[PDB]
Amino acid sequence: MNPIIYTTLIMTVMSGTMLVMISSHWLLIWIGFEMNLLAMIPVLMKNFNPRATEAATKYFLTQATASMMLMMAIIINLLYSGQWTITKMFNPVAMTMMTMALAMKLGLSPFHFWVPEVTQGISLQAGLLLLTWQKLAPLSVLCQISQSINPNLMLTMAMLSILIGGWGGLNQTQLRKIMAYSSIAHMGWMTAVLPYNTTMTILNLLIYITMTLAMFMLLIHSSATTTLSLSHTWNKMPVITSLMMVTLLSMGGLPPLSGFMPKWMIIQEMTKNESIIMPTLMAMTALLNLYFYMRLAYSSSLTMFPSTNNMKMKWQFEHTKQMKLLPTMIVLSTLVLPMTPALSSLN
């Protein structure tokens, strides 16, 4: 599309997210969600093909249903109390409806089915945007209404998200599906601490966004969307594969990398509230995400897969377009554990 129109659509997406973040009226928050979806739909179809159209229509269906249930919850809350301000809800039924609408918007299980398909359908840049920037507004609304959430439902969908992501990531060779399932698992981790502490939620969100940005930018640099296409990268630029392996290790929660910081703190916070079984289950479940990260690392950088003859010509060319902030993203996603106590900044 036209670069001016692309910039306009991206700015409209960001403006919808900011309108959700800065408004205190439920109608304005719903308007921000509506604007975000309306401006996001074209970005998913920037490259036109049947798969992109399918991903866009699935995404539109799910997001429109979620927005309609959101408005239903808002109007019920208005009915049982003439309030438009976003605070603790005054009705339990409206509270569950709002929780389910926001879970559908985030992709929490059992509303997770659309995430792998939409991620696979769209390109890598659209997948980056969808998996990073589209998680901000629903999580902000959840942080605002955290005091009224029922812990049972919220934690049930959190644990379901973690289990589903761990299990579904094991069966994937496509990289975008792996990213989608990893995002599902990380949203599950984010959600499980909302009833107890929202600062931990924001910390996990920031760490996951950094890690996902590094992952997706490394995947864009080495234009690979499958395991086998990525296995060819060592024969052209091994530094990318080494950084990618370190980033994958960080994403799996291995100390002393950055990915250990959220889970650790999250577990700690949950332990403060006499919750022992759930953090244990969550850790042993995250072992599955670590397993398929390790499989990707094995097939990518720790072994040298067979190459092709045409690869030689690609040795004579460099990357014309560079992604700025990639080294910063890698460093922030791998080597920020010693600065854990900075979370008091309420990030």
Binding site: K58, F113, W167, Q172
Partner: peptide
């Protein structure tokens, strides 16, 4: 056990009829 559960979870035909019925 993990392989069986992964097969069960990931074997979705991609048809939205089943998805929204489960919803």
């Amino acid at each position: 056990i993990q392989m069986k559960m992964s097969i069960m979870v990931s074997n979705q035909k991609g048809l939205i009829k089943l998805y929204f019925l489960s919803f």
